[PDB]
Amino acid sequence: QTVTIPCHHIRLGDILILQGRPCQVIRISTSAATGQHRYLGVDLFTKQLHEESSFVSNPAPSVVVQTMLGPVFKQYRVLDMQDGSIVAMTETGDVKQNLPVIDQSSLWNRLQKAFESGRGSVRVLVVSDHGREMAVDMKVV
Amino acid sequence: QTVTIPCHHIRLGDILILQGRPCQVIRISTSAATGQHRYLGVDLFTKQLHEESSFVSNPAPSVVVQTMLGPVFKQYRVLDMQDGSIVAMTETGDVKQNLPVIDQSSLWNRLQKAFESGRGSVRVLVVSDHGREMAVDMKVV
Numbered sequence: 001q002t003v004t005i006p007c008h009h010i011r012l013g014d015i016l017i018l019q020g021r022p023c024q025v026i027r028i029s030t031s032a033a034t035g036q037h038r039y040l041g042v043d044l045f046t047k048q049l050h051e052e053s054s055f056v057s058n059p060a061p062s063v064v065v066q067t068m069l070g071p072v073f074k075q076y077r078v079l080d081m082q083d084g085s086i087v088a089m090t091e092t093g094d095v096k097q098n099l100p101v102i103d104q105s106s107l108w109n110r111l112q113k114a115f116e117s118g119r120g121s122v123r124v125l126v127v128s129d130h131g132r133e134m135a136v137d138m139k140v141v
Numbered sequence: 142q143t144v145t146i147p148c149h150h151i152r153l154g155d156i157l158i159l160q161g162r163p164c165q166v167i168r169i170s171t172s173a174a175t176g177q178h179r180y181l182g183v184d185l186f187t188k189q190l191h192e193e194s195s196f197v198s199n200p201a202p203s204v205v206v207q208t209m210l211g212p213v214f215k216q217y218r219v220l221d222m223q224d225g226s227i228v229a230m231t232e233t234g235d236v237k238q239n240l241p242v243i244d245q246s247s248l249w250n251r252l253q254k255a256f257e258s259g260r261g262s263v264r265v266l267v268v269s270d271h272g273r274e275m276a277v278d279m280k281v282v
Contacts, residue, residue, distance in 0.1 A: 001201075006211075009150040035282060060142075062215040062231045070147075074203040090203045141176060 007037050007054050007066040015127070015136070016041060017069040018052040022127050024104075037066060044102060044136060045129055073125040075139065081115055084108070086135065088124060099126070101135045111138050148178050148195050148207040156268070156277070157182060158210040159193040163268050165245075178207060185243060185277060186270055214266040216280065222256055225249070227276065229265060240267070242276045252279050 002017055010016065014025050016039060023041025030037055036053040043050060054066040076088035076096065088096045101108050101124075114122050124135035143158055151157065155166050157180060164182025171178055177194040184191060195207040217229035217237065229237045242249050242265075255263050265276035 003147060005150055006144060006146070009146055009155065009211075011152065014150065061233050062217060063213060064216050065213075070150075072204060072206075075205050076203060092202050 001072040002069040003072055004067045005070045007068060010037075010039070010068060015044070015071060016052075017071060018050040021045070021050055022071050022129060023050055039068065044104075044127065044134065045132065071127050073127060073137075074133075075123045076126055076135075078111070078115060078119065078122045078124055081112060086111075086124065088126075088135070096133065099124075099133055099135055104136070107135070107138065111135075114138065114140060142213040143210040144213055145208045146211045148209060151178075151180070151209060156185070156212060157193075158212060159191040162186070162191055163212050163270060164191055180209065185245075185268065185275065186273065212268050214268060214278075215274075216264045217267055217276075219252070219256060219260065219263045219265055222253060227252075227265065229267075229276070237274065240265075240274055240276055245277070248276070248279065252276075255279065255281060 012025055012028065015022055016025055018039060018041045022044045024044060025039050025041045027040035028037060031053065036056060038051060038053050040049060040051045054068055056066050058064055076090055078086050079089055080087040085098045085100050088099045101111065121140050123139040123141055125137040125139060126133050127136050153166055153169065156163055157166055159180060159182045163185045165185060166180050166182045168181035169178060172194065177197060179192060179194050181190060181192045195209055197207050199205055217231055219227050220230055221228040226239045226241050229240045262281050264280040264282055266278040266280060267274050268277050
């Protein structure tokens with residue numbers, strides 16, 4: 001699933017859906033001809049570059065809004081850490097044995113130290129790309 | 142009207158609705174007991190301080206989202222500049238004779254120089270507070 005984000009709340013480093021792919025934004029520019037914003041991002045899964053321009057709508061008189069789509073992050077519990085991947089569990093009890101962890105900003109070591117400190121409190125934020133799941137951030141409940 | 146904003150897209154300086162008032166965020170903190178985020182902001186109209194904590198929802202299994210409300214900005218054309226206030230016009234032709242301009246980050250002088258340069262291209266972004274309107278930013282179409 002996706003969420004609509006207003007463009008004035010998008011900054012470098014945010015994760016957006018570009019060309020149907022979840023990407024980390026690395027450049028923001030503005031089109032001189034249309035006024036749309038252009039977003040250059042890095043595919044979280046393949047590391048390829050993608051670009052997409054914003055969507056302009058007029059839902060009411062005197063209201064002009066530019067939006068992009070962002071992913072809906074899922075929150076899983078961490079049951080075990082095994083060799084780069086983790087054993088995760090959904091809120092309903094569905095067990096995921098080999099969930100990969102992205103190599104971005106030392107997430108694995110941040111996750112490792114919080115797990116040994118408070119296993120039951122650690123959560124991973126997960127994105128999906130047409131069936132494939134990956135942990136891209138962590139949270140402490 | 143308002144728009145729902147995810148908390149991970151809110152940064153210092155953003156404008157949110159706090160306690161029913163539009164405010165510029167000046168401090169973001171996290172509640173140790175609940176995990177909610179707390180936002181301290183400055184009322185754009187009265188300059189008083191207000192604080193509000195985020196709303197936590199669970200719209201689906203394994204989906205936890207924290208949101209705040211932001212204002213829906215209206216876009217008016219600038220017909221004339223008169224003594225701190227401006228004559229503005231909506232997209233449907235409704236004329237507003239004495240629209241005030243906020244004193245934040247030298248908006249009046251930024252608006253003044255763009256008006257003399259390209260009057261027809263200048264737009265002001267306007268917020269409403271239970272009937273009262275004020276220009277809080279500008280745009281060039």
